[PDB]
Structure formats: C-alpha cells, structure tokens
Amino acid sequence: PREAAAHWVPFEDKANMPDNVPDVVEVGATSAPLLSASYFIGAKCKPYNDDFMLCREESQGSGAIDCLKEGRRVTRCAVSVIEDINKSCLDEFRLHWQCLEQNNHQLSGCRKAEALLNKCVFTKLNLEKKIPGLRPDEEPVFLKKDPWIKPAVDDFKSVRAYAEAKKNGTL
Amino acid sequence: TYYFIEITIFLAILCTIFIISAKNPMVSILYMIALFVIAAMYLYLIGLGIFSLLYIMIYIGAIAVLFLFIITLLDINSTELSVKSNIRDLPLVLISLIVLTISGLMIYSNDSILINKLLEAFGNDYNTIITQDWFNIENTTLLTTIGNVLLTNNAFILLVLAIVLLLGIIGPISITMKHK
Amino acid sequence: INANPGFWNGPFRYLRWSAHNRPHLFFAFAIGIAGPVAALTLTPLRRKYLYPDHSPLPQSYPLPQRAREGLTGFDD
Amino acid sequence: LWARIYLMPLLQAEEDRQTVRRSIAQLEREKEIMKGTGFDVDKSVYNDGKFHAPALMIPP
Amino acid sequence: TAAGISLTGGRNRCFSEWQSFMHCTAKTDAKSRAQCLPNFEDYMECLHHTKEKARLREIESVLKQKKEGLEAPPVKVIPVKAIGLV
Amino acid sequence: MIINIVEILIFLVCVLFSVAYLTVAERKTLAYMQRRLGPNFVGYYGLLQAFADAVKLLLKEIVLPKESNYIILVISPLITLITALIGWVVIPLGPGITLGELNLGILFSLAIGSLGVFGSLLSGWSSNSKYSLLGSIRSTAQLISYELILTSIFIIIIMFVSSLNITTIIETQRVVWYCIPLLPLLLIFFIASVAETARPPFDLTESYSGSPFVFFFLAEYSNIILISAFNGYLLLGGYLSFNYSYLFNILFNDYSYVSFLFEGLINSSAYAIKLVFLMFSFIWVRAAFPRFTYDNLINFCWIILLPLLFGIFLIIPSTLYIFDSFPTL
Amino acid sequence: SSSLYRVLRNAWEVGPRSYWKQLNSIGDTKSGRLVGTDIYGNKFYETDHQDEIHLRTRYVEYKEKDYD
Amino acid sequence: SSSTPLVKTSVNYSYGDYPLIDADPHFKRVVGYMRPSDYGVIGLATAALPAGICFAEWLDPVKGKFARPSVKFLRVATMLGFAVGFGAAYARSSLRFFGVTENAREYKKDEAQMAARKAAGLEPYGTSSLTPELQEIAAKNSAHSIAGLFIFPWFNFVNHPYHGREQ
Amino acid sequence: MNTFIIFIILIPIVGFALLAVNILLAVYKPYNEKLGTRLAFNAAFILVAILFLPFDLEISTLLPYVMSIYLVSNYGFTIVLLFLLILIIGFVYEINTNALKINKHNKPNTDSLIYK
Amino acid sequence: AIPFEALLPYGIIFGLLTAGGGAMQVLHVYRNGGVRDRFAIDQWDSQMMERDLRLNGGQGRKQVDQATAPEAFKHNHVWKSERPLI
Amino acid sequence: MFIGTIILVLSFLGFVFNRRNIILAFICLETMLLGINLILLRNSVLFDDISGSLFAIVIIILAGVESAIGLSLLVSYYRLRGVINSYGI
C-alpha cells in the first residue's frame, strides 16, 4: 500500500503451491492488451469478479486463503475472454494495443482502432463495451464526434485500416 | 548505497556542532541552511519527496531569508567560543546529553523494565517486507490527501490557521509602525 | 485634488469616485466579489437550463451488498 | 477508471496466490530451520485466528 | 478527523485491527473491559511489531549457530536490472 | 549508461551555448533598436563575442577586499550559478523529454527559484560597507516581493490541471493554451518575470572581476531563459504548435527513427520559437523604459498587483464552480 | 539599408574571393567602381547604388592586414 | 444512491422534554420557522447596541463633556447589533428543533412538510450536489454547531440525508 | 543512475572548472591602493520582508487545495473561499493602514502667511 | 528593413534548442526500443510496468500478448525487503 | 527516530548553553522544530497514514508564523537600544 524507499532489495521464492489447492493457469497479457480488453473482461466476468470481492468482504481478515476458489475462477474466465478475442480478432486487437503502447496508454488517442475492435468483438464475440454509472442525457466519451481532446499523431496502420473499413462498408 | 540514512544522521550531528560554534553569526546561519538541506535529503530518503521540496521552499526560502535579512541591517555583538567561558558548562552538558539522549530514546517502548525500554529502541535489524496490492485505482498522492483532510475533516483547523496567519500579519505591523 | 466623500454620504457617488480615482482597488474588489456572488446566484440556473451535474467517479472497487449466490460456471 | 476496476480482481487473485505460496514457503522454511529445538513456528503472534502475511525478514 | 485515513486516502495499515477493537469497545461497558484485552494487543503489535521482532530474534539466534544453515527451498536475491531475466 | 550521459552532455552543450549567444543577441538588437550596428568585430558576423569576453574575463585579476569574507564572496557566485542552472532539468522539449521526469516538477521549479535569492543577499555581506549592505537589502526585498506573485500565478494555473507534473500541463494545453483565456495573467506574469531577474525596467540597485563576475553573468541570463521556459510551459503552449497529424499521414507510413526525429524537431522548434520571442520581448522592454524608485516598486507590487491577484484567486475557482468543471487528477 | 537582399546581391556582384576578403576586412558587403589606386597601394571605390545612406558612398580597400 | 446514510445514528434521541425535529436543521428551515418573538429579539439587539453606546457615553463621556457619538459609530453598532440578533434568533430557533424548548407550533409544520414531500415524490431532506461521503463529512462538521456560538458562527447548508430520525 | 543526478553533480563541476581556470590563469599582484558604525533605516524596509512571510505561507497553503480540487467539489471550495476571505481582510487592514510606505519627511510647508 | 545580423544569434539559439530537442527525442526512443516515453506514471502504472517486465522476460516494454502465461512466471515473483529505516 | 531525537537534543543544548549572541537562540529554536518534524514524519510513514503528515504541515506554518512574530519582536527590542548584547537580553 506504501511503496518501498531507502534501499529496498528484491527477493523471490523457490517454492510451490501445496497439494491442497489445484493448478490455475495464469494471465500472460501485458498492460496494453490488458487495458485493451479490460471492458470485455469486465463484460463477461462481472458476476465472477463480484463474487470474488464479495468473498473478500464477507470473511474479513482471512482474506487470501478463504477466497482462493473464486480467485481461481476469475483468472480462468479472463483467460477465456483473451483467447476468445485472440482467435477471432487478433489483427485489430493487435492494432488496438499497438496503438496503445504509444501515447502513454491513453485511451483518448486510439479511437479509430477501438471503433474497429468494438465492431469486431460485438458482432463475433457478442460482447458490448459500456460505461456504467452513466445516466441517460449523457453521451459516452468513446462515441462522440469531434472530441476536444485529439491525440498528437494518429497511428498510420489504424487510419489506413479505418479508411479501408469505410470503403468496404465494414464500419 | 545502504548506509545513506546513517550518513545523513552523522552529517546532521556534525552540522549542529558547526551551528553552535561559529566565528560570525551568519556563518552559523549558513550552517543552519545546510542542516535544512540535510533534513530534505533524509525526507526524500525515507520516501517523502513532497516534503523535502516543501522544506526547501518554506524553511530555506522564507525563514532563512528573513533571518539573514535581519542579521544584515541590525547590530549583534558576539563572543566566540572561548574555552574559559564554556568548560564551566561541560559537566552538566555531558550529564544532560547522556540523560536527555537516553530519555528521548526511552519513550518508544512499553515495558515495566527500564533498560528493556532502552534496548528495544536498538532492536532495529529486521527488514520490512513490502507487498503489492492492486486496490487503488488513481493518483492520489500525499499532497492530494493533505488537501482532502485539511479541507473536509479538519476544515476548522484550516480556518483557525487562517486566524493565525492573520495574526502574523497584524502583529508585526502593529509593533513597527508608529502611527503618525 | 480629489477628496474622499465616504461610502456613507452617498453610496453610488462613492462607487463612481472609486472607479475614477482608485481604479486598482475598485476593480480588484469588483473581480473579487464577482466570484462568490455568481457562485451563489448562477449555478441553479445552469443546473436548470444548460446541463445537470455529472455522475460521480468511482474511487474503490465497487462492492455490491449480496451474499455470494451460486453460479454454475467454471466449475472445473 | 472503469477500465482499472475491471482489471482489479484479475490482478488481486494473482497477488493473493503469490502471497499464500511465499508465506507458506517461509513458514515451512523456518520449520526446517528449527527442527530439533522445541519451538512453535506455526503459531501466530496475533491473538486472532485470521491469516496474515509475514513481515520483518532478516537481510540476506 | 483523520482517524483511519492513509497516505492514499484509503484505510491505514492497522485499520482493521483498530476497527475490531472499536467493535469490541462499542458493545461493552466498563466493568467488562478485561475481555477486549486481546484485540488491543492485536492492535498494538500491529503498530509496533514487538512480538514478531521477538519471534524473529528467537529464530535468528538458532540459525546463527548451525553449521548446516539452511536445508530448504531457499530465497534468491536479484539486482533490480534482472526481475524477469530468465 | 552510455545513453544517459550522452543525453545529458547533449542537453548541457545546447543550453550552455544558448545562454552565451543570448548575450550576443541582446547587444545586436539593442543596437538596431538604437539605429546602430551591433558587434561585427570578432566573428564573421559578430558571433563568438561572448566567447571573446569569457576568454578575456577568465584572464582578469580577482580582487578580494580588506572588508571581505573571501570564502563567502567566491562561493556566492557558485551557489547562484548552480541553482540558476539546476532548474534546467524539468523543462520538456517534447512529451516526456526532460532530464528527470518527476511527478512534482512545478514544486521543484518553484523550490529552486526561491533558492536564487541568497546570492544577492549573502553577497551583500561580502565587502561589508554600510552602502554595500542596504543596497543588497533593497535588492533582496524586491526579489522576494515579486517571487510572491510568481508563485501565485503558478498556483492559479495549476487550478486548471490539478497536477504538479509539467508535461501533463502541456498535454492539457492541447485543447487551448492558457494565455488565450488568461491574458491579463500573461501581462502580470511577464512583468513579474522581468522583476524576478531584476531587469533594467525594474532595476534600482545597479542604478568584482573575473570568475565572480562571469558566474553572476551566466546566472543572470540562465535566469532569463529559465523564467522564459516557465512562461513557455504554463502560460503559452509548451511544445505545441498545431495538430500536424494530417501532414504526417501524407508524409510517413510507419514509425521510424526519422519520424521520431522529425516530430522532436517540430516540438522543440515550437518550444524554442516561444522562448526566442520571449527573450526578444525582454530585450525590447529593456530598450524602451526608464527605471523605478524602490517606493514605486513596492507600491506597485504590494498595493496594485497583489489585490488584483486576490480578486483572481476568488474569480477563477468560482467559474470552475459555476460550470461544474473541476479538473481531475 | 539593413537588408539581407543588399548583402545578397552585393555578394553576388563582387564574387566569393572578394567577398571573403571584404568579410575579413569590414563587416559590410560593398560593390564599387575602382576610381583609382594609391602610391602606397590602396584601392578606392565609389558606390552608385540607390539604397545607400549618406557617408557610405566611398571607401578604401587596403593592402596590408594591419591597416591605418 | 445519494441518500443512503451508510452510518448508524440516534433515532428520536430528544435533548429535553420535548421531541426533536432535526439533529441539525438546514439554514432555510431555521429562517423559515422562526417566531415573531425571534424577530423581536433581532430588533431588540439592533436597537440595543447604538442605544448602549449613547448610554455609555452619557454615563462617562470620552473627552470630558457629553456629545453624541458619531454616525460612523452608530452604523457599525447597528450592523453588529443585527449580527448579535441574528445569532440569538438562530440559536433560539435551533433549540426548538432539538426539542429543548417548546416546539408544538413547529412540529405540526414539519409533519405537514414531510407529508407534502412524500406527496410530491422527492427525497425527504433534499437532493444534494455532493457524494454521500462528502455529505457525511459535511454533516459531521455542522452537527450540533449551535453550541459554541460564542466562539465561531457555523451553519448547515448541505442537504445531507440523516437528521436523527427514523424511516 | 538516471539522467537527473549527473546534472546535480555536473553543474558544480562546470563552476569549479571555470573559477579554477581564472585563479590558475590570471594575475594576482595586489596592493593597498587597489584594495578597499551603522546606519538607521525606515520601518517599511524591515516590514516588507517580515510581512512577506505570512502571505508566502498562505500561497503554499493553497497548494494542498489545488491538487485536491476535484475530490472536495462544492464543499472544499467554500472552505477555501472562507480561508481566502479571512486573509483578504488582514490584507485590507494592511493597505488601509498605509504600512509599506516610506513617506517623505519635508512638505512644501502648507501653513499660510499671516501677519501682526 | 529586417536586420539579418540581429536575428542570426536568435537563429543559432533556435537551432541549438531545436537540434537538442530532436536528438533527445531520438535518444529517448532508442532507450525505449522504438516507442515513446511515458510522461506521467501512477503508482498503479508503476506496478503495471514492473509486472510487464516480469511477464515479457527481461525486456523493458516488449509487451507480449500471450494466451496463458509461461512456467517461470509463477516463480519469478518479487517482494521488496526494505532496510531498518534508522 | 534517531536523527530527529539527536537534532532536537543537540539543538536544545546549543540553545541552553548559548552565551554568545541572540540569533543562535532563534536558529536553535528552528532546528528544534525541524527535529520534531523529522520524528513525526517518520512515524507517519511507518504507520501508513496522513495524520502525522497533517500535524506536520500545520506545524510548518506555525513555525513560520512564530519566526515572523519573534523577529519583529527582536526589531522592537532593537528600536530603543541600537545594540544587541552578546551575553543576552
């Protein structure tokens, strides 16, 4: 919760899970693919994530050990979403997070690639990108036309793919 | 680069001894400015990078400037550290050094026992384990939370503090004007 | 030479006098009191006509208040 | 903000499993240290039975 | 007040032990306070880590005298240049 | 480790050349404003004259008077040289191009600018004469009196960003600069910047040899370009010129080192053209105006500018309040 | 004038050889007529060009590198 | 959402003989519910400060023989008299909300008003432009601030959800 | 090991080098003719730097607020308004008293020419 | 009209700062490995950068996108042990 | 806690055995306040909370105001006596 100062030295641990708890395979996506598919991880895995944090609230202070069985399932369902999005939308998911690794991982600067990614994932994986807590009479930010905050330079691959999706009639 | 805190502790000792024994009154004040810099070094060292620049801005840039500004246009006599003057002081200096030092080290401890109170101040050797938890989603740094709690939970302290700043305006004026 | 009439002998005449002869103090106090008076009197008009207020940003993970109802998914 | 809280339980489960594994590893390690000598390493110094990650290790 | 507010505006490190102690002290009147002695103890050594320092000194006193030292899954130290190297 | 030391000696060679040529530039445009030529005697068109002057003044006799602390008198040049130069880290020549990217950059730029008062006041205690003291008193009194309103304008600008990072302010200024809404603040900040160096619009105390002279000389013009840098990032656009996305989608096809080279050229050309127009305006206001009495100066700061600044303190959070527009971290 | 066009066209009229010597002698660029030379050897020039100020029409090119 | 109090709170914990109305009333409700005797207290204090200065001059004059005080003193006396009278009337009227003085005139007005706000289909204490965390902190600041009227004036202007009542 | 600290240590190297170059390079050769109580001051001189500090402490008291400005929205705004106005009242004290003036001691001697 | 000589030292000031900014941007991109710098880094994004250095294998911001994480990823996890703070 | 304790103790004893001038007493007072700051900010870091940071940011301002007040007090001490004695007030 506080960060290490004044000569911290890092250390790691040559050990294993005990036999009591089964194997769980991990998430291997880094920040730009994780930030790219964050809304679709949240759209599919909402009741699993909320049961995990509700576990953590319910049995206070035990925490780690009494919530492992649902921390299993949140990781497995997010892995399901990520390979689902790989095998359907690999090239434009890659287009999106390759836009996102420039521009400080700001979602504000990658609108023309995220329109393509949202259209693919919505027609093929049937998951929708939504911002909750947003009452009506309020436009969502990634839908608006001519925003005030444009990026410095639009990425070339995504504006080329965006124009070709215009002329195909994809989007 | 392990012994950094120890080095700042030692250099702070040495700087205070140069403060209290100095030819010229403003040689002593420049040693105080150096002690402020050693303080800000320790504060960045422990993890408080905000406070160190607050110390350099407020203490060095306003209080030391006011102090040097006073020494310039006022006349202050000074004796220097004669040995005839001050080794009459030294036996009580030594007794009070050891007593006040041990006694300041005493109150971090909870024992019935006197020197178990003392040597738990030196039981320092264990290296704190820093864990990452992903529960915080935004850049609330320390100045943000000081601005939240000066302004919501301790808003009355901020307004009584405004009265104190008001007094720091009114008082020096009220002394030094000689109204007509 | 221009003397001070005082705020009390004539109010609006003193306001005109201060605007002509002490313009830094008059316009400093003008800009100063334009702030909180419009903060009082204009923001209900904006909430009525221009646009209502934004919804609050989340600060933590949002915990709902339920009892971990059983879900048949990822039983493996 | 909503993106980060969609990502939070996914990484929290991660660091929870890392905490459980390394703490049980340290517990077994000091059990393997003080074999022979009668001493309880499994016992918490906290009086409540809740689980806690260890701190304050000896520098290597 | 700023009773349990941390540096990030969250709850501090010993908030949960303190809130357990206050849950204790809310449902008790005096003449009956001797039973919430453990919670307070749990709070105080949350603050100062006195019993953990005592326990770790007791175990370090034993590992200093072994010729064998450590027969365990050991712990590695890395440079900061090499967190994910291999 | 080859990378950062080559980067820092590239930055040092750029800024310590550009503080030398600012001197050659002020003599030439002061001359042409006065309808005469500048120097053309020492270079092909007058250049490396600051080099000629530095070459000669590092040959000049140093006089340490009867009256003087010798140590205090020659390390007040260095403490003013070093803190007039330390503030050159945090300025960005592009998004994230500083010598140290720290999240509290304005707090640093504001703490170093308060360290610059000492080498006036302290060096009054050098050569202790009764007139060598109260002139330094008037100097330091003006210095602190105008860094007050400097700090004030900074905190007014941070009411729009709510972040002490500096390139965050410049990325925030992409939608509009901060001079276009707050143009009285550009006027107030320009005159406070002119006072903070004690430029000869706002000079009174003017009106050594060798190393204590060239250190003060370099500190003066480094302070010129440093407060010009402060104006360039928080009030004008820092490295921002226009959109230049359509021009790139014409020219380039993918990220290459020549494209990053071209983008850095455009960004720091915008930053440098702001800074150069600002230094020209410093010399241009030097050319046209007489100087101040101390009483006109103190009356100006404490009685005229500061109440107006209190009005600005009240007016700007109130309009950020009327329309529900508070900046988020 | 103070123009760049004037120094431009005078540098083109006088030529680069003569430009480098006139840059190593004076700061200006001047296009003359060679009215005559000295018994010491000092070429003199008169400039008829329109954008000249009073007291600039006539000048000397010396012989030695230390000139009087 | 924006009216759940999320704390535990006194329920009808009356501070005197008489039942409470609010645990801190809003400023508008205090100005709305004050009696003609309270406006008489405001007028009494507005009259008593300049008359008091004239009186204390008539007792012991400043420069030896009696003059009236200047009008510059009488106007500041009347301004501070309105300040004393408004502090007195606000404290008097807040006492009726707490149930330490007689409030049967105002208890009828509050049951009428909360019945009207149930009939109008809106929230019982007002929609506020604050997050519920800030409403809670803002009402911890102004809770029972009528004690300590001698030191500082402090009022309630936040429409926070809890007032020491049920349902 | 960042590019921040080479600067911190390298600017002195710049200075130490240059004043070395002159002290190492130039003529010293001084003599007596080349080499070479207390006065009273007005109150506004000492006053400008004494009253400087309470305004400076206010300006760095705004610095926690303008970083927290979103979180305390509509509430910390009014607390800051009251803070600023409480200090504006001490400032209008200061400029109503004409404190920071140094005023000239000799007039035209306005008093008229009467006779007998 | 416009003196070219007056504006040439401004021209060299402009050119020196322009070339410095361009050379420094390419030095930053060469340090990152072909991408731009991150100009404002949260505590969250600091933790995210160290996690991605753990996941990619050695490299700074290579930014792997893999289905499921490797074998040494469960074992290369780091805690930080900070000194006594005397 | 060591650095704040020793700067406070050495600052205190330098204040107490000051016989040479008056401004050493002022600067020993300010360094005492610095040592109190050091101890408190370390405790705030170790306990993971802002409340020691709250008392520290308030005592910074109070130390500044006391320096302003007391140095105007010294100036008024100096008004009637154009000298400040070495032995003390």
Curated annotation (Swiss-Prot), chain B:
Gene3D superfamilies: NADH-ubiquinone/plastoquinone oxidoreductase chain 6, subunit NuoJ (1.20.120.1200). Complex I is composed of 37 different subunits. Disulfide bonds: none annotated. The keyword Transport applies. It is found in: Mitochondrion membrane. Its EC number is 7.1.1.2. Core subunit of the mitochondrial membrane respiratory chain NADH dehydrogenase (Complex I) that is believed to belong to the minimal assembly required for catalysis. Complex I functions in the transfer of electrons from NADH to the respiratory chain. The immediate electron acceptor for the enzyme is believed to be ubiquinone. Its main location: mitochondrion. Coiled coil: none annotated. The gene is ND6. Keywords: Electron transport, Membrane, Mitochondrion, NAD, Respiratory chain, Translocase, Transmembrane, Transmembrane helix, Transport, Ubiquinone. It holds the Pfam family Oxidored_q3. GO terms for molecular function: NADH dehydrogenase (ubiquinone) activity. The chain crosses the membrane at residues 1-20, 29-49, 50-70, 90-110, 155-175. It is a multi-pass membrane protein. Belongs to the complex I subunit 6 family. This is NADH-ubiquinone oxidoreductase chain 6. GO terms for cellular component: mitochondrial membrane. It catalyses: a ubiquinone + NADH + 5 H(+)(in) = a ubiquinol + NAD(+) + 4 H(+)(out). The keyword Cytoplasm does not apply.
Swiss-Prot record, chain K:
The keyword Cytoplasm does not apply. It is an enzyme of class 7 (translocase). It is found in: Mitochondrion membrane. Gene3D superfamilies: 1.10.287.3510. The keyword Aminoacyl-tRNA synthetase does not apply. Keywords: Electron transport, Membrane, Mitochondrion, NAD, Respiratory chain, Translocase, Transmembrane, Transmembrane helix, Transport, Ubiquinone. Belongs to the complex I subunit 4L family. This is NADH-ubiquinone oxidoreductase chain 4L. The lineage of its organism: Eukaryota, Fungi, Dikarya, Ascomycota, Saccharomycotina. The gene is ND4L.
